[PDB]
Design a binder for this molecule. Structure first.
Ligand code: CLA
Ligand code: CLA
Ligand code: CLA
Ligand SMILES: CC(C)=CCC/C(C)=C/CC/C(C)=C/CC/C(C)=C/CC/C(C)=C/CC/C(C)=C/CC/C(C)=C/CC/C(C)=C/CC/C(C)=C/CC1=CC(=O)C(C)=C(C)C1=O
Ligand SMILES: CCCCCCCCCCCCCCCCCC(=O)OC[C@H](CO[C@@H]1O[C@H](CO)[C@H](O)[C@H](O)[C@H]1O)OC(=O)CCCCCCCCCCCCCCCCC
Ligand SMILES: CCCCCCCCCCCCCCCCCC(=O)OC[C@H](CO[C@@H]1O[C@H](CO)[C@H](O)[C@H](O)[C@H]1O)OC(=O)CCCCCCCCCCCCCCCCC
Ligand SMILES: CCCCCCCCCCCCCCCCCC(=O)OC[C@H](CO[C@@H]1O[C@H](CO)[C@H](O)[C@H](O)[C@H]1O)OC(=O)CCCCCCCCCCCCCCCCC
Ligand SMILES: CCCCCCCCCCCCCCCC(=O)OC[C@H](COP(=O)(O)OC[C@@H](O)CO)OC(=O)CCCCCCCCCCCCCCC
Ligand SMILES: CCCCCCCCCCCCCCCC(=O)OC[C@H](COP(=O)(O)OC[C@@H](O)CO)OC(=O)CCCCCCCCCCCCCCC
Ligand SMILES: CC1=C(/C=C/C(C)=C/C=C/C(C)=C/C=C/C=C(C)/C=C/C=C(C)/C=C/C2=C(C)CCCC2(C)C)C(C)(C)CCC1
Ligand SMILES: CC1=C(/C=C/C(C)=C\C=C/C(C)=C/C=C/C=C(C)/C=C/C=C(C)/C=C/C2=C(C)CCCC2(C)C)C(C)(C)CCC1
Ligand SMILES: CC1=C(/C=C/C(C)=C\C=C\C(C)=C\C=C\C=C(C)\C=C\C=C(C)\C=C\C2=C(C)CCCC2(C)C)C(C)(C)CCC1
Ligand SMILES: [Fe+2]
Ligand code: NA
Lengths: 36, 38, 48, 30, 31, 32, 76, 30, 27, 67, 348, 484, 38, 32, 30
């Protein structure tokens, strides 16, 4: 209980979510679904 | 002479005049349907 | 915008249902359930 | 005769029976 | 715990994470 | 091929007066 | 009651979730990278869309012989 | 519908006279 | 009578015909 | 207060003489559930027959069926 | 029940376990809602991810091959497969899951399970409303979207040649379905669709206007400027001045609501009515009954090459949509129509 | 007072007045049935039952009449191509006037029950309050329903005492009202088998009688009684609405999908028959069979009947109308007066081209003449300035082999384009459009109108059932809870 | 329970309901006249 | 010319529900 | 006769709107 911050946990989850969104958007310009 | 109308009257249609009017309408109907259909 | 108009209809139906269900009995299947008290009191109706 | 569609339908109703049996056991548990 | 909340949260969480991994993997395939 | 003009004429000349006299009779019977 | 606000702060959650969640991420990696998704769900790879016999989109034209037609015109 | 409309009108007349005979208002004032 | 002709001559007029759709694996 | 006494009314009176007269326990709930299950299986059978998805030897599900 | 002994059976224990305050309510209808909705969302998410459409439609509808969330979809089966339910044990699949997915049986799976999940969930609104004892106007309200689901995903493909003309579960798939009804059915012109549009737009209108009116009549109720904390769930007074609201809209719009029972019933009424009328419209379109022609307009435009309307432009534009889209949209039709029979404007 | 949507709730607790409104409705629907039958007899033209069938004339209740046995009327005609036999009292107009007399009798009975409503029959003996024993009432009506189903299945449809069913040819050529023997096997559940209906009715009536016996002798259970509120009339209201829209869904589904209970000679062809090339493959295989042995073209096609070519025409299709394309299909694109024949198209060097037909979804489809294999060889061009597919340079010629037009071949003028456009719809027919001031757009079939109305009503009654189920389950919160 | 019906109720339609009914009928006619006349 | 069927349909769809709503209004205001 | 029908229904609905706006029942209970 309270050993690592809840706000910091939310920050780490947010960094992973933004990273996944960035990876998904990056995959649209390269490879399959890149029209090239 | 005031806001409500003292000349207001209610309508009365008894059953005898009802039956007479209905008979009148349907007798006019049987008389003129054959002629409008022509 | 399509999500918002569909959601606006959804939230309209949802709010309407949740607060027309939350009715303390002042309007019965007659015009109103005034038998408890007639019009003219601050005793509020409904529930939230 | 026993058409493959009918045989598969019989196995299908048996499978549905055991699926609802497992669901009944799960809702009986927990 | 294995209560109904445990079962519901895990049934939602496990395949979402599994497929998120699968899609992140599919982000790197070239024709 | 069905004379709809005469049909609607007969239908209206029945319906309008019988309904009107029924309204007057109902208000006479309700309000004595 | 665990209202979900305490478990994230607790380190005991992340003791076992630093293995299960990356294990599922790696499981998805091997699942699609080993072609198992293609093999299980019938997904065709990018180099098996137009075979030598037909150069256009596959056409369906059947109801009852559907499985025999997929054995005819699948990705070999 | 040629004969049917005259049929409706004649039945209406018969029903009206039947109701006037039986479902009439009772004769009041003498 | 001639089974291959009658399906093939229903083919241009109407391709959704039962005669064309049944047993299309052999074609 | 009393209703109009009627000959056909007192004829058919026993048929309305037991309003709410109800058996206790679960009654025949198991039997009606079994009947509903058999009725649902029969309905699924006629559905899959009328879907051309339960092929039988004699049923053709076509205009040729009445040929 | 009703002052009886009521000797406890397995039904009583099962009902007592099903009606408990949990993280998510289960209830008796949870025997249907939870598994059926689970397979509905799982089938849609898997078919958007792995299950392809290179068999059925001959196009890409999966995450594995280059389709985004806006592009991938659970595609419908093919017209040649008819209205078959496509069981795993059905004559099409014959118990092969790998080729069941490829023939599009997952679409029928998701559609049937989504229907039964809808049944279970709105049954659950009955179960909750009975558990805590108020009227099920939530169920009467949600009666309209399930009628929409029935009319769109079941009644229209049942009336057509097969599930191929059903809406595939997706984003661009529903977009294609919308454009299909535009080109082939003239679905904008149908009055039932017009009443559906009116109902939903009026419902969004009512939601926005009611929320804004309540929020701008919220009284003082405190000294902090954050008015949300100025509300107290304990207090029995109205959170908003409906007198002030009524006189406001009486002087702005002319007519205003005077009974909030009528207000909230009307904002329940408009979307349900609109969805029900549009559902009846889709029921009409299921049998290819469409509001397509205005016979006076085509007769007068035929005898006079000078008369035209935006309606006439829309009809000709519908012919364009049909001609240029059905060629690949309906692969079973073998539409190898050349370009000189496909119609054009000048320079385009 | 009472809201406008509540005026009928005054008789929820008055069984006598409930009888009154029920009998009033029965009178109204009986009068409507009689009026519609006489109206459709007045509009009906039996001059050409071969080429101008009643389902092409917007006929709705006469096909339900003919399906069950009545085929002739009082005027001296029969729709089966024969002259009238002895008509008796049970003709078309006889049934209409009989339903009118029923309407009057039911009207007078409704008035009687309205005036006399507090019968002791409606009063409970034990408590003295007005009550109805709904499980016993249901047992009674289940016994009568089983008896009526058994009588209709063992006496009417079997032909031992009734006439049978309007059965037909598989392609809608030869059909009449005849008895059919029941089938107890799998073919008994064959939907297109006419023999399944008598076995269906016999088994269903027997089962209904036995179930009525259990409902008469056996009482319900307390748990079930407080489960679905059997002691209330709103529960039986909701359940009855549920059952009737279930039946409406069944009837609409069978009407669209075709059945032995849906004669094609009374209701027209099917959209699935058109899309699946049913009459087309029939006509073509008959021609191919006649060509294979003996007779050649231009006389073998004359062996093709007048009915089948009319059936193979999308203007007869139920899936081509509109909501407000109103009236008979004859009023749409004229009355059919004759069959031209099969338009045969040849190229300049000589090879048979085929016209691509117009599917149900398309209001307008391109007219293309495609090769024997399935290659595009000619088309009516939009640009008319490019390629080698325009008719005047490809050189196609239209021949015909049928009734009115058999041996005059056209190659030069726009007549070949006109006949390609006409045959692109199916078989080419002459229609007169001046008799009914006919317009030209395609009207809807009586099947389509039936199925549209009954699907919409079934879904609306789904709303009615779910609402009355809500009201019955939740009678405590709809009426009042009084601060608890 | 007596000679007059105890379940007799009166009907109430205020001016707001009159306006709503007239608006519904007239807007329905406005929408569907173009289709009925065609 | 003139679509008499449509004219009749539109005319009755106006008058009959309008007369219905007005008659309940005036009978409601007659006896409040 | 077509155009005056549309004109009449439109101006009639506008008249009902005008009458409901200015000659409504005065509002009670809030
Ligand atoms: C003296 C009794 C009588 C007789 C002999 C007839 C005879 C006829 N009627 Mg008729 N009718 C009657 C009474 C009668 N009617 C009454 C009292 C009413 C008022 C409700 C009607 C209302 C009526 C209408 C609206 C119509 C007819 C029509 C017809 C004609 C064709 C019927 C048909 O083939 O459709 C087929 C009949 C059916 C498909 C009925 C099926 C019954 C369903 C399946 C019952 C399902 C629920 C059931 C209780 C379940 C049982 C469960 C089981 C286990 C027991 C026919 C000549 C039709 C016509 O042609 O117009 C004149 C038509 O339009 N009638
Ligand atoms: C569900 C039952 C049913 C069915 C399937 C049919 C089917 C049919 N009828 Mg019919 N009819 C019925 C009930 C039914 N009718 C009833 C109850 C009546 C008494 C009023 C009539 C009276 C009647 C007549 C007088 C005629 C027909 C005719 C016809 C045929 C022509 C198509 C048509 O109906 O026009 C088109 C159908 C529509 C345009 C449907 C309207 C769409 C919806 C309902 C509009 C919604 C209402 C809307 C608010 C109205 C606002 C408009 C307003 C501005 C005026 C057709 C096969 C014609 C015929 O062929 O004669 C034999 C014919 O002349 N019927
Ligand atoms: C045979 C089926 C049936 C029966 C017996 C009832 C009976 C009843 N319903 Mg109900 N209902 C039904 C089906 C049925 N309903 C369906 C299908 C729906 C979905 C549309 C509804 C939706 C519904 C609602 C929302 C409400 C009721 C209500 C009521 C109660 C009083 C309303 C009333 O009748 O006053 C008179 C009704 C009118 C004056 C309606 C006006 C006439 C309409 C607009 C046009 C009529 C056209 C023509 C004459 C007939 C065409 C219909 C026919 C072809 C089917 C009453 C006991 C009320 C209730 O629940 O009580 C609390 C209520 O508010 N019903
Ligand atoms: C020459 C000329 C004139 C040319 C015009 C030609 C022309 C284009 C004509 C138009 C044709 C025509 C009418 C087309 C429309 C046809 C159409 C689709 C009709 C729909 C018909 C129909 C039956 C639809 C069914 C669906 C349905 C029920 C929709 C109803 C929609 C509807 C009425 C919505 C409500 C609208 C609305 C203004 C809401 C009221 C909001 C409001 C005033 C709140 C006030 C308020 C808010 C509070 O929060 C509080 C607290 C208080 C107190 C309070 O007061
Ligand atoms: C919106 C509602 C629901 C969205 C979530 C449900 C679907 C989840 C799966 C999506 C997915 O896996 O995409 C997976 C795709 C994968 O991206 C694709 O990957 C392929 C790999 O084979 C190819 O490389 C493609 O080129 C590449 O683009 O990601 C995307 O498409 C990017 C967007 C991700 C989804 C965002 C949806 C939410 C957007 C806005 C929501 C706003 C408000 C919501 C309010 C309500
Ligand atoms: C709200 C309440 C209900 C809510 C949820 C319930 C959801 C149920 C979803 C399943 C519904 C039934 C699915 C199977 C039905 C089916 O496949 O039909 C398809 C099959 C027929 O199948 C078709 O038959 C044709 C015959 O010429 C052709 O051969 C076609 O190729 C063939 O596909 O019909 C049935 O088996 C059932 C018909 C009777 C019930 C129909 C109800 C809807 C009616 C529609 C009429 C047209 C529009
Ligand atoms: C009064 C209000 C009438 C409204 C209806 C007007 C219909 C148009 C008309 O004038 O038709 C007028 C038509 C006649 O129309 C005439 O017909 C002639 C041949 O008989 C010729 O073809 C004429 O050219 C044609 O004008 O007759 C009708 O009354 C149509 C019947 C309407 C009912 C059909 C069944 C629909 C059933 C259910 C639909 C609703 C389902 C639920 C809701 C969704
Ligand atoms: C993307 C840009 C986002 C902007 C969103 C705009 C927010 C208001 C839009 C609705 C219009 C008015 C609704 C009716 C309305 O005004 O609601 C009522 C509410 C009023 O709250 P307060 O007045 O307490 O807050 C504003 C200040 O007075 C705070 O002291 O509005 C807000 O919630 C503002 C907070 C939104 C914060 C940004 C989001
Ligand atoms: C310069 C000012 C700008 C505004 C002028 C234009 C405003 C138009 C007035 C709104 C319409 C009035 C509706 C009457 C119906 C009416 O007044 O009902 C009466 C109702 C008031 O009900 P109460 O609150 O009195 O109900 C409680 C009672 O039971 C107790 O007394 O009004 C409303 O529900 C709120 C207004 C909704 C308005 C609905 C919008 C209707 C759209 C009309 C579209 C016409 C078709 C196109 C035109 C041809
Ligand atoms: C008294 C009497 C009598 C009789 C009489 C009569 C003759 C009656 C009748 C009657 C009738 C003759 C009736 C009919 C009717 C009709 C109806 C009943 C109808 C209807 C309607 C509806 C329901 C509709 C609906 C709708 C609309 C609105 C439009 C279109 C669409 C729809 C469908 C939605 C006699 C002497 C014999 C004997 C005994 C006594
Ligand atoms: C198919 C099928 C099945 C079933 C299954 C299931 C039931 C499951 C599942 C599942 C699931 C359930 C899945 C999932 C997925 C998900 C995902 C893939 C996600 C996502 C993505 C994204 C992109 C996101 C984003 C976001 C948002 C928007 C929200 C929040 C934030 C974030 C950022 C996270 C089986 C095999 C049995 C058999 C039959 C068929
Ligand atoms: C909890 C939360 C969340 C999450 C969030 C996040 C994710 C956050 C973050 C964030 C971050 C993560 C941030 C960062 C930052 C940083 C910054 C902003 C900085 C800076 C600075 C500068 C300006 C720079 C400069 C420079 C240059 C220019 C270059 C190189 C060198 C140097 C470094 C000097 C969500 C939404 C889910 C929910 C709600 C809340
Ligand atoms: Fe509110
Ligand atoms: Na152009």
């Amino acid at each position: 209980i309270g050993r690592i911050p809840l706000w910091l946990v939310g920050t780490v989850v947010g960094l992973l979510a933004i990273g996944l969104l960035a990876i998904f958007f990056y995959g649209s310009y390269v490879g399959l679904g890149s029209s090239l | 002479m005031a806001r409500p109308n003292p000349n207001k009257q209610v309508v009365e249609l008894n059953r005898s005049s009802l039956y007479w009017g209905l008979l009148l309408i349907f007798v006019l109907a049987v008389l003129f349907s054959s002629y409008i259909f022509n | 915008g399509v999500a918002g108009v569909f959601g606006g209809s959804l939230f309209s139906a949802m709010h309407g249902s949740l607060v027309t269900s939350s009715l303390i009995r002042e309007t019965t299947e007659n015009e109103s359930a005034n038998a408890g008290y007639k019009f003219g009191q601050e005793e509020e109706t409904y529930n939230i | 005769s026993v058409t493959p569609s009918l045989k598969n339908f019989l196995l299908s109703l048996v499978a549905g029976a055991v699926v609802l049996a497992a669901i009944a056991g799960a809702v009986t548990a927990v | 715990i294995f209560t109904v909340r445990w079962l519901a949260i895990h049934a939602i969480a496990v395949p979402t994470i599994f497929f998120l991994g699968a899609i992140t993997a599919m982000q790197f395939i070239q024709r | 091929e069905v004379n709809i003009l005469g049909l609607t004429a007969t239908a209206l000349f029945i319906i309008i007066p019988t309904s009107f006299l029924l309204i007057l009779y109902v208000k006479t019977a309700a309000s004595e | 009651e665990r209202p979900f606000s305490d478990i994230l702060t607790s380190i005991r959650y992340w003791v076992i979730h630093s293995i299960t969640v990356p294990s599922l991420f790696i499981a998805g990696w091997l699942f699609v990278s080993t072609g198992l998704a293609y093999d299980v769900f019938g997904s065709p790879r990018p180099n098996e869309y137009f075979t030598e016999d037909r150069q256009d989109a596959p056409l369906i034209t059947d109801r009852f012989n559907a499985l025999e037609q997929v054995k005819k015109l699948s990705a070999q | 519908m040629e004969a049917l409309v005259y049929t409706f009108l004649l039945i209406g007349t018969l029903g009206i006279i039947f109701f006037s005979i039986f479902f009439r208002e009772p004769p009041r004032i003498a | 009578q001639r089974v291959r002709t009658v399906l093939d001559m229903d083919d241009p007029a109407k391709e959704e015909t039962v005669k064309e759709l049944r047993k299309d694996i052999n074609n | 207060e009393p209703g109009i006494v009627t000959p056909l009314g007192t004829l058919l009176r026993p048929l309305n003489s037991e309003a709410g007269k109800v058996l206790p326990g679960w009654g025949t709930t198991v039997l009606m559930a079994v009947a509903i299950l058999l009725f649902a299986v029969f309905l699924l059978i006629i559905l899959e027959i009328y879907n051309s998805s339960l092929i039988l030897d004699g049923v053709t599900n076509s205009w040729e069926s009445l040929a | 029940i009703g002052t009886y002994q009521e000797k406890r059976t397995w039904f009583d224990d099962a009902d007592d376990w099903l009606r408990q305050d949990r993280f998510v309510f289960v209830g008796w209808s949870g025997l249907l809602l939870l598994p059926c909705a689970y397979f509905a969302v799982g089938g849609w998410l898997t078919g958007c991810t792995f299950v392809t459409s290179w068999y059925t439609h001959g196009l890409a509808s999966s995450y594995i091959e280059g389709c985004n969330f806006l592009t991938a979809a659970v595609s419908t089966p093919a017209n040649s497969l008819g209205h078959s339910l496509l069981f795993v044990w059905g004559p099409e699949a014959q118990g092969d899951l790998t080729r069941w997915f490829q023939l599009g049986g997952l679409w029928a799976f998701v559609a049937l399970h989504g229907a039964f999940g809808l049944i279970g969930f709105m049954l659950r609104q009955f179960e909750i409303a009975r558990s805590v004892n108020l009227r099920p106007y939530n169920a009467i309200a949600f009666s309209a979207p399930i009628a929409v689901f029935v009319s769109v995903f079941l009644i229209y493909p049942l009336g057509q040649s097969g599930w191929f003309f059903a809406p595939s579960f997706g984003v661009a798939s529903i977009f294609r379905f919308i454009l299909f009804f535009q080109g082939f059915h003239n679905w904008t012109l149908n009055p039932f669709h017009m009443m559906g549009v009116a109902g939903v737009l009026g419902a969004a209108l009512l939601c926005a206007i009611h929320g804004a009116t309540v929020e701008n009549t919220l009284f003082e109720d405190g000294d902090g400027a954050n008015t949300f904390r100025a509300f107290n769930p304990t207090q029995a007074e109205e959170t908003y001045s409906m007198v002030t609201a009524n006189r406001f809209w009486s002087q702005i719009f002319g007519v205003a609501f005077s009974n909030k029972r009528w207000l909230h019933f009307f904002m329940l009424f408009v979307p349900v009515t609109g969805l029900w009328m549009s559902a009846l419209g889709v029921v009409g379109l299921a049998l290819n009954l469409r509001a397509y022609d205005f016979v006076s307009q085509e007769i007068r435009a035929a005898e006079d090459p000078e008369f035209e309307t935006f309606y006439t432009k829309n009809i000709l534009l519908n012919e364009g949509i049909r001609a240029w889209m059905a060629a690949q949209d309906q692969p079973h039709e073998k539409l190898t129509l050349p370009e000189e029979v496909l119609p054009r404007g000048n320079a385009l | 007072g009472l809201p406008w949507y509540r005026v009928h709730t005054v008789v929820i607790n008055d069984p006598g007045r409930l009888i009154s409104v029920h009998l009033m409705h029965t009178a109204l629907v009986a009068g409507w049935a009689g009026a519609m039958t006489l109206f459709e007899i007045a509009v009906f033209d039996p001059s050409d039952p071969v080429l101008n069938p009643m389902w092409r004339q917007g006929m709705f209740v006469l096909p339900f009449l003919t399906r069950l046995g009545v085929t002739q009327s009082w005027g001296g005609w029969t729709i089966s191509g024969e002259t009238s036999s002895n008509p008796g009292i049970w003709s078309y107009e006889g049934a209409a006037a009989s339903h009118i007399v029923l309407s009057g009798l039911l009207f007078l009975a409704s008035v009687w029950h309205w005036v006399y409503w507090d019968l002791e029959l409606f009063r409970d003996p034990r408590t003295g309050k007005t009550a109805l024993d709904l499980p016993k009432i249901f047992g009674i009506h289940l016994f009568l329903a089983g008896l009526l189903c058994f009588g209709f299945g063992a006496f009417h449809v079997t032909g031992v005492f009734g006439p049978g069913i309007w059965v037909s040819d598989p392609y809608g050529l030869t059909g009449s009202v005849q008895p059919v023997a029941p089938s107890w096997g799998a073919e008994g559940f064959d939907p297109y088998n006419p023999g399944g209906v008598p076995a269906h009715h016999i088994a269903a009536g027997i089962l209904g009688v036995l179930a009525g016996l259990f409902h008469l002798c056996v009482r319900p259970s307390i748990r079930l009684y407080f489960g679905l509120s059997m002691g209330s009339i709103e529960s039986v209201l909701s359940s009855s609405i549920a059952a009737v829209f279930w039946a409406a869904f069944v009837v609409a589904g069978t009407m669209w999908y075709g059945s032995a209970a849906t004669p094609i000679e009374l209701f027209g062809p099917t959209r699935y028959q058109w899309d699946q090339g049913f009459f087309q493959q029939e006509i073509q295989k008959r021609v191919a069979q006649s060509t294979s042995e003996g007779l050649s073209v231009s006389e073998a096609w004359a062996k093709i009947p007048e009915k089948l070519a009319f059936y193979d025409y999308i203007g007869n299709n139920p899936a081509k109308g509109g909501l407000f394309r109103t009236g008979a299909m004859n009023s749409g694109d004229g009355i059919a007066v004759g069959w031209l024949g099969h338009a045969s198209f040849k190229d300049q060097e000589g090879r048979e081209l085929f016209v691509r037909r117009m599917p149900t979804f398309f209001e307008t489809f391109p007219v293309v003449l495609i090769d024997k294999d399935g290659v595009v060889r000619a088309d009516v061009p939009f640009r008319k300035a490019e390629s080698k597919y325009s008719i005047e340079q490809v050189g196609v010629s239209v021949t015909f082999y049928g009734g009115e037009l058999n041996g005059l071949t056209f190659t030069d003028p726009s007549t070949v384009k006109k006949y390609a456009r006409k045959a692109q719809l199916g078989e080419i027919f002459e229609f007169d459009r001046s008799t009914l001031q006919s317009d030209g757009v395609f009207r809807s079939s009586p099947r389509g109108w039936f199925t549209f109305g009954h699907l919409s009503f079934a879904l609306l009654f789904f709303f009615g059932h779910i609402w009355h189920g809500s009201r019955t389950i939740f009678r405590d919160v709809f009426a009042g809870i009084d601060e608890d």
